[PDB]
Symmetry: C6
Subunit: 180 residues, 6 copies
């Protein structure tokens, strides 16, 4: 509604960039994450628990959840605006919705980025994971599928999300120096 | 027709949220539920009956049935309204359809949530299931595919359904304090 | 054309209900019907003939044929009406087409329901099928994939088809008490 | 252009019927025609040549070719009409195109039906085929996937094609009793 | 722009015919070209190099490249025409673009047909290929998947391409007897 | 906005050419890149690390990233233009956006072409790769799937990208001889 140049151009383009990466290239990279997960063992069920332990949620599913979460505040505004428009036919209020929506986008973007770091150590996928969860005997060596390609796409998504955080913080800074 | 702000915004957004989770992320998590179901046994047919025993209906199929059921009352209203519109050209009556439709949505939402709890104990998927159905000899250990990721998506869908119940109860409360 | 409330609302909603069940949930339930059909034998070709014997046509293919058959009479009417409209530009006749179309819909619905019962005994799929067709030696035990989930969807489709029969019979009753 | 009731209603509906069967139900029946083709032998390459010998072209591909061939004469007319319309802006001639198009449809329909009979003996798929093509040693037993379901759909397609031939012959009879 | 009857009817219909064959029937025929390529050997890597040696590019990929290549000259004209239209608002020139576009279509059609012959000997696929490329020991027998069905579709595409060449040559003949 | 003939015709046609190659033919040439990657070894995990070592990112994913990157500058301009249009309603500036966009396209095109050369040596895929990464014992022979077909498509994409660089350099040359 009252977006700046970066609000409606550099934020909408980067959002489409993230979706395009997810659906065109990234999704099929993760297609055989479990199928080509190879563990050096003869113990039945060891592969299931080790993959589940080291990948509690896939990266692409986490990114899909993140994109769904950061697009919801914009969607809520587009229905509140279309509702107040018809209600009158039957600033101030609009300002508080647009400032909170930016605030919620920053929180959602930072929360998922924090989840990525805590759950997956850093941002580089390792070739070998060592697993001692039951029923694997002692420690079992398992090997990840396409660790390098997944690292490349992880860096792309994290870097763009970090840029989107900065582009949202500046808009909050601009809106919080005039009003207050 | 006579919806409040939460009726046409917070209820329609949450409904789209559930569909987006189901088709974009959740469905492929359950892609190999039976293909990667691994049992420690040499008995033919044991894997078929143990998977069937512990998963009488898949979670995503239950969620798809729930969404189809909770969207039907809205669909029925949108056809009754378009029918009465042309019938006159050839409140009161509309009020009773909109109050019952909300009532049926609450019952449908609560019924499926109850089915989820009774059928699947709690809301967390276990890594190991112990099965003694014929023809499995004694008790056979079987291992579930992606139990943690399925648990995460189960919590998401249950929480949103619980919120949707509250958003529907308040609208019934508002409509049942003015008329009665 | 001259449909009642149940003719254009409760019949069109149920028809869409059946299609949504078929394409969104049911079809992938039957995805691995033969792939996970497991027989306890070492005889080549035994699995092929036993599956063919017990599933001469898949449930979803029978339902797809049923929906195609019960939608043609309506499609024929919508083209006859659009043809008579332009022919004049270049009741009575329309009444006989709409009464026969309902009649054919009832026959098609009842015929497929009868085919379901005769071919598949009841409406519950069994876990074990015993097969003695050549080249299987003596009697061979075979195990069905997802028997419980298939039973659940079978009951849903049969119940809705039975309701659709009743909704079509009443319209025939209403049209056959005024004219005759 | 100058079609009768059966020309534009009963012929167009049956054509959509054939396409609907092909794409919705029939295509996935033939999905594992070679994958589940099982031969009782240890000879490498025997399965490839026996399947190729007994299925020189799949039924669904033959039906797809038939539908493409019987729809081209109508497509050619729809471009000739749109070409003569603009040419004048820049009967007799139209009659000869519409009579030949019906004639070519009958020939194409009968040619493919004749191909089906000659290539595949009758219209019922057998469970067992005996194959002695090199490099199979002596005669090798092979087993077809879903022979009964394929027979059911073969009968449907042949019966509808036979009806379409009759519906096209009558139109030729009507056009060949007035002009000649 | 200045096309004859065969230019805009018989050439556009045949082009759609080739696309329809490619996407509806032909593409799935080549679905398991390498998966069902069977060689009589125990040498790892032998199957990879023999399939690559005998199929440097798949037939459907070659046909897709042909259709893409023979469609750009028409696409280039449709953008040059829309560019000159707006440029004036801001014959002779159009004639030279339409004559060269037909010329390039003939060259592209003939080049790919020549590539098909040189690369694949004739137009019939053989059941057996004998391969001696490293690391295969001596000569290894390998067997092609669906050779007869692929031969049938190869003949269809070659015959239509030959017809399209003749339809393009006549238009060049007509355009080169009036101007010169 | 101020594009020449080559800017809006020969550059947009080549861009569509690259997308058509990628989605219609190229993507499923790379469909089984890892599935048919065959290594001569019995060491678990050896295949995973050798494929990852020699294919850090798939060619099609690199091309998809390249197309996304070289289409962003045009997308940014189309939103800046639509933003300045409405801002006035509420040359010079447009010139600097269109000149930088061409500049960024050249850099992005050259950067990815350089990445292709450095990462993959030349532009021809080899049949055999020798791999000594842990845990592979000594040096292990591995064999690539469809090396010749991938080489053919690699040459096509490199040649078109090189042409696109030249078409973009000339436009920069034309714009940098009038202004400067
Ligand atoms: C809008 C603006 C957005 C900007 C976003 C910028 C994103 C930059 C992406 C750069 C990706 C590379 C950095 C992360 C990868 C680190 C690992 C790495 O370099 O891998 C080495 C080879 O990689 C390679 O060869 C990978 C090269 C990738 C080239 C760039 C693709 C485009 C192998 O080294 P290792 O053995 O340690 O690998 C261990 C992993 N398995
Ligand atoms: C509109 C508003 C809607 C609000 C809805 C809120 C939904 C919140 C979702 C939270 C999901 C986590 C809670 C349930 C999972 C319990 C199990 C759990 O924590 O798993 C541990 C690791 O999980 C993890 O590491 C899971 C991390 C998930 C990150 C958040 C997803 C984004 C492993 O612990 P264990 O060994 O007991 O696991 C046994 C399972 N196999
Ligand atoms: C518009 C209105 C249309 C109304 C249509 C109503 C349709 C109602 C669907 C009810 C489905 C259940 C009844 C048929 C299933 C009978 C078998 C059964 O109960 O299975 C037991 C567990 O089932 C279960 O746990 C199944 C629970 C399904 C929950 C409801 C679905 C939502 C296992 O008992 P068993 O060992 O005898 O099973 C033998 C089968 N393999
Ligand atoms: C517009 C108007 C269009 C009208 C078109 C009419 C088409 C009618 C379709 C009828 C299909 C059945 C007749 C052909 C099948 C002959 C074989 C047969 O009956 O199979 C028996 C069981 O079949 C069965 O149980 C199949 C029952 C199929 C019921 C109908 C489906 C709808 C097994 O007997 P066998 O051991 O000789 O089988 C040898 C085959 N493997
Ligand atoms: C617009 C106008 C476009 C016109 C284009 C016309 C295209 C005509 C297509 C004809 C295809 C057949 C000729 C080429 C196939 C030669 C091989 C052949 O006949 O195969 C025999 C059985 O074929 C068969 O049984 C194939 C029958 C195909 C029926 C027609 C398809 C519809 C087996 O004989 P073999 O043992 O030598 O086979 C060695 C191959 N593996
Ligand atoms: C807009 C304009 C854009 C223009 C772009 C032009 C692109 C031209 C594409 C030409 C592709 C061929 C050149 C590169 C391939 C080099 C390898 C080669 O020739 O392979 C030989 C057979 O190839 C073959 O038989 C390949 C034939 C391909 C036919 C042309 C495709 C249509 C086998 O020789 P080798 O044993 O050394 O192969 C080692 C590889 N595994």
């Amino acid at each position: 509604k009252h977006s700046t140049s970066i609000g409606k151009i550099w934020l909408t383009v980067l959002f489409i960039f993230r979706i395009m990466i997810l659906v065109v290239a990234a999704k099929e990279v993760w297609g055989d994450e479990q199928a080509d997960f190879v563990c050096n063992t003869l113990q039945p069920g060891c592969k299931n628990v080790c993959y589940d332990h080291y990948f509690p949620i896939s990266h692409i599913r986490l990114w899909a959840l993140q994109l769904i979460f950061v697009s919801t505040p914009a969607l809520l505004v587009a229905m509140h605006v279309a509702y107040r428009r018809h209600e009158k036919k039957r600033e101030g209020s609009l300002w508080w919705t647009y400032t909170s929506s930016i605030f919620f986008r920053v929180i959602f973007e930072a929360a998922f980025m924090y989840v990525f770091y805590v759950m997956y150590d850093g941002f580089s996928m390792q070739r070998l994971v060592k697993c001692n969860a039951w029923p694997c005997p002692n420690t079992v060596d398992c090997f990840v599928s396409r660790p390098t390609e997944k690292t490349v796409f992880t860096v792309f998504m994290i870097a763009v999300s970090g840029i989107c955080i900065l582009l949202n913080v500046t808009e909050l800074c601009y809106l919080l120096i005039r009003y207050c």
